[PDB]
Amino acid sequence: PIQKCKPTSPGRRFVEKVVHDHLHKGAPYAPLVEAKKRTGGRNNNGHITTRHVGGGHKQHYRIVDFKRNKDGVPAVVERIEYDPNRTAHIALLKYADGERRYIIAPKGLRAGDKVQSGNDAPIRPGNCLPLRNMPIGSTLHNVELKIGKGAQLARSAGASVQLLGRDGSYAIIRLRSGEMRKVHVECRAVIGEVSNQENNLRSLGKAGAARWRGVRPTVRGMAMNPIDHPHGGGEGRNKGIQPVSPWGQKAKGYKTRTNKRTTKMIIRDRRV
RNA sequence: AUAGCACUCUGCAAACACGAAAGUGGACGUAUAGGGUGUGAUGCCUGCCCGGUGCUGGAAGGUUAAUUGAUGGGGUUAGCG
């Protein structure tokens, strides 16, 4: 419902939050949770490789089944839960044989629904099937690129691709970036679209909200000295240069794709 | 610096960064995500110019490297003298 907070303080004047009343309010399912440590954007040499990372709240990792390799055994949804590691919600599945797992929750899925995976699964949201058995024109998510590896494409909140055609050994899908590409017909996908589609409606409101999520301040290159950045130096404000990164790579329009091995998989570019 | 705004890059063995390499961060994330650049709550808004430099897409005409080696010109000596 996108609730706006009342302007009781200047830090609250501009807070837009998203509320979903159906999320489970207790602790997560313990056998499927494991520890996760903060990195600070540093690698095994100890140097910073990604800037603006650090701090934030402590988080546990939820083990999510991306492979969906329990074929033919129906499962029932127990609850929908909030996951701090991603923007989508997750669903807890209880199988007819007692095993419990976590999956990315499709939009509309509620406690009590039934899901399945395999060649013979019926066409209902949350069911996992090979693309060869998927009806043409379907809206899908959680698309797998290598046989047996699991879902890699269209996993974020509100994400969807759609299947325009299938011929030979390759199905044609269009992605949310606007791109056409082919996928092997034996790779799997899931029926429907990802939940939490209102995720991008939130307004943080203040700097502390970004600090809670673990983002450190960005300093403009214009604000430094020549020894630090190509944009540095000068008396007063002055750009006087075509924009580049701290390492000298142009920032407006210059393309960076280099891989020559997957080029034959891409039919139509989205005007990169 | 900041929440907000915009441009641009990146289809995943991602772009990008560290490192001589192996490898590591990005991220046990997947375009509602991640990196770079500028502006800076909010209200009203944000005009003209693509000639220059840059970027993006074209063309197969001119010019041009390694490589290849067609012809031509010298040195030497069998022989003729």
UniProtKB/Swiss-Prot annotation:
Transmembrane segments: none annotated. The keyword Ribonucleoprotein applies. SUPFAM superfamilies: Nucleic acid-binding proteins (SSF50249), Translation proteins SH3-like domain (SSF50104). Residues 37-56, 223-255 are annotated as: Disordered. Pfam families: Ribosomal_L2 (PF00181), Ribosomal_L2_C (PF03947). It comes from the Bacteria. One of its GO terms (molecular function) is rRNA binding. GO terms for biological process: cytoplasmic translation. Residues 228-238 have a biased composition (Basic and acidic residues). InterPro entries: NA-bd_OB-fold (IPR012340), Rib_uL2_dom2 (IPR014722), Ribosomal_uL2 (IPR002171), Ribosomal_uL2_bac/org-type (IPR005880), Ribosomal_uL2_C (IPR022669), Ribosomal_uL2_dom3 (IPR014726), Ribosomal_uL2_RNA-bd_dom (IPR022666), Translation_prot_SH3-like_sf (IPR008991). GO terms for cellular component: large ribosomal subunit. Keywords: Ribonucleoprotein, Ribosomal protein, RNA-binding, rRNA-binding. Belongs to the universal ribosomal protein uL2 family. Part of the 50S ribosomal subunit. Forms a bridge to the 30S subunit in the 70S ribosome. One of the primary rRNA binding proteins. Required for association of the 30S and 50S subunits to form the 70S ribosome, for tRNA binding and peptide bond formation. It has been suggested to have peptidyltransferase activity; this is somewhat controversial. Makes several contacts with the 16S rRNA in the 70S ribosome. NCBIfam families: rplB_bact. This is Large ribosomal subunit protein uL2. It comes from Acinetobacter baumannii (strain AB0057). The gene is rplB.
